[PDB]
């Protein structure tokens, strides 16, 4: 039922990708980047799910099953989500560089740990967990302050997307620890189903919330 779950993830990401592309067809010169980023976020995820649905990238590591495309997906898409949040917050190059750096450590850490048999994987997890707390600090602190300098509508959207992000992203590390990568209490099937749900919400749900605010922002 794994392939079936991966196909559902692919379909969900595809629907989102198309909706975002269509919704941004007539976007102004200032909204453009936002729509394009959303397309890239869900588009790359759709590819990762298709690759896994086709049975590619499955890695039977020390009596467990980890999926390489899942982590590759994250390494490339989460920084785009952070970029989107950063654009709303109005960050400069330096500030973007800081959060992208932190985000990348998180994703590379989970990927490396997932491929590492033995207790060493937990040290790698720790590296990612600490970087993640640092990322959360920037999102709720400095970046929120930066967002406060924008319009009420922008600040409002930033906050909604940031909350969704902080709260749901915080769940992934528990699934990593409880799933195949860690103590393997969750079966590959349950692990994949929970991630499909979380991925769809953090990418497609995230996008629809932005699309829903578009008209209000233009009116401002």
């Amino acid at each position: 039922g794994l392939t079936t779950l991966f196909w559902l993830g692919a379909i969900g990401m595809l629907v989102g990708t198309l909706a975002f592309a269509w919704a941004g067809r007539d976007a102004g010169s200032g909204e453009r980047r936002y729509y394009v980023t959303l397309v890239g976020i869900s588009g790359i995820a759709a590819v990762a799910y298709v690759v896994m649905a086709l049975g590619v990238g499955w890695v039977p590591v020390a009596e467990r099953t980890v999926f390489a495309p899942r982590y590759i997906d994250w390494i490339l898409t989460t920084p785009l989500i952070v970029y989107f949040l950063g654009l709303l917050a109005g960050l400069d190059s330096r500030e973007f560089g800081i959060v992208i750096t932190l985000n990348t450590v998180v994703m590379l850490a989970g990927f490396a740990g997932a491929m590492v048999p033995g207790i060493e994987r937990y040290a790698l997890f720790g590296m990612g967990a600490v970087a993640f707390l640092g990322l959360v600090y920037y999102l709720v602190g400095p970046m929120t302050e930066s967002a406060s300098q924008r319009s009420s509508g922008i600040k409002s959207l930033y906050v909604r997307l940031r909350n969704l992000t902080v709260i749901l992203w915080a769940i992934y590390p528990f699934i990593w620890l409880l799933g195949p990568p860690g103590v393997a209490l969750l079966t590959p099937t349950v692990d994949v189903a929970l991630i499909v749900y979380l991925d769809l919400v953090t990418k497609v749900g995230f996008g629809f919330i932005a699309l829903d605010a578009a008209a209000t922002l233009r009116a401002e």
């Binding site: 969704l164 749901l168 915080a170 769940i171 699934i175 929970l194 749900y197 919400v201 749900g205």
Partner: protein, 53 residues
């Protein structure tokens, strides 16, 4: 209805694993699928709650 429907879908998938495992006759295999189902449902609640919030 959304969270409710999804929780039902998840339970069904979880049930599928338990049933499949039971077919083998290995009590340990069933236990593994069951613990997974229980922890999965609890996490699902976390997700749903986080989403609502």
């Amino acid at each position: 209805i959304f969270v409710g429907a999804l929780t039902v879908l998840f339970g069904a998938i979880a049930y599928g694993e338990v049933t499949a495992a039971a077919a083998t006759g290995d009590a340990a295999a069933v236990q593994e699928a069951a613990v997974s189902a229980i922890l999965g449902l609890i996490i699902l609640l976390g997700i749903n709650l986080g989403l609502v919030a």
